[PDB]
Paper text:
In this study, we biochemically characterized one such protein, UMAG_00027, that is highly expressed during plant infection. We show that UMAG_00027 is a secreted protein with a lectin-like fold and therefore term it Llp1 (lectin-like-protein 1). Llp1 decorated the fungal cell wall of cells grown in axenic culture or proliferating in planta, which is in agreement with its potential sugar-binding ability. CRISPR/Cas9-mediated deletion of llp1 reveals that the gene is not essential for fungal virulence.
The protein fused to a C-terminal hexa-histidine tag, was expressed in Escherichia coli SHuffle T7 cells and enriched via a two-step purification protocol combining nickel ion affinity chromatography and size exclusion chromatography (SEC). Diffraction data were collected at 2.01 Å resolution at the EMBL beamline P14 (Deutsches Elektronen-Synchrotron; DESY) under cryogenic conditions. Due to the absence of known structures suitable for molecular replacement, we employed isomorphous replacement using single-wavelength anomalous dispersion data obtained from selenomethionine incorporation. Amino acid residues 23–241 of Llp1 could be unambiguously assigned to the electron-density map and represent almost all the residues of the protein construct employed in this study (Note: N-terminal 22 residues comprising the signal peptide were not present in the Llp1 expression construct). The secondary structure elements are connected by several loops, which contain four small helices. In total, the molecule has three exposed disulfide bonds probably conserved among orthologs. Overall, this results in a compact and stable molecular fold. Taken together, our structural analysis shows that Llp1 has a high structural similarity to members of the carbohydrate-binding concanavalin A-like (ConA) lectin/glucanase family.
Author numbering: 23 to 241
Write the structure that this text describes.
């Protein structure tokens, strides 16, 4: 399968994640209707070799194709009226899966091949009073809330099926954990390998910031 890498908090909980996903998954030379690569930033409560085996997961997925070619976006592409279907388009969508509550596809944002080349900004943020997670793409229509899980999110997983860069990842904890820095580990596929441009930590030890997380082919 695709490459999955994760960092894991043990006593602290993850309370916020922003991810900036580079626009590099689509192919402007492909025929209409073809798919490209995809990349996810996923939150879970327990460790899993394949994060999507988890009984409950919340993912922020970037797909290298028009949303019309992504199954489960029907009637959920909130900017469908403004983006003509075109080769080189991309799609951004939040999805929560739960073995108890079901498969809940969030709103999807279509991205034009003619739009300025810029990273896609995903955010998932806990509202502790509301006991819900704000999710989606800030300053766009593709936004919704999800109820917090019984087991709070403690693991963030980055998955990609091909070469991809997350230009920026900001993870925030409800309490400091120095071990979070070194919890980085992958389920390797001997096909892609990771490299991180830079990792920083805030003064209070709450906010970890990764710069230029790149999955690239080994051979």
């Amino acid at each position: 399968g695709p490459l999955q890498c994760h960092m894991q908090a043990f006593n602290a909980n993850i309370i916020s994640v922003d991810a900036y996903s580079a626009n590099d998954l689509s192919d402007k030379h492909a025929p209409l209707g073809a798919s490209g690569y995809f990349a996810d930033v996923t939150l879970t409560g327990k460790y899993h070799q394949d994060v999507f085996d988890a009984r409950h997961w919340l993912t922020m997925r970037h797909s290298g194709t028009d949303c019309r070619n992504v199954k489960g976006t029907d009637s959920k592409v909130c900017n469908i009226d403004y983006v003509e279907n075109q080769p080189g388009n991309s799609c951004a969508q939040v999805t929560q899966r739960s073995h108890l509550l079901g498969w809940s596809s969030g709103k999807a944002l279509d991205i034009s091949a003619t739009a300025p080349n810029a990273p896609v900004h995903f955010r998932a943020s806990l509202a502790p009073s509301l006991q819900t997670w704000w999710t989606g793409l800030p300053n766009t229509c593709a936004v919704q809330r999800y109820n917090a899980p019984h087991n709070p999110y403690k693991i963030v997983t980055l998955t990609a099926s091909g070469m991809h860069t997350w230009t920026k990842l900001v993870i925030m904890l409800d309490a400091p954990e120095p071990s979070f820095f070194k919890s980085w580990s992958c389920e390797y596929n001997d096909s892609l390998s990771p490299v991180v441009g830079n990792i920083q930590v805030s003064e209070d030890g709450k906010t970890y910031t990764l710069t230029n997380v790149k999955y690239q082919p080994i051979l």
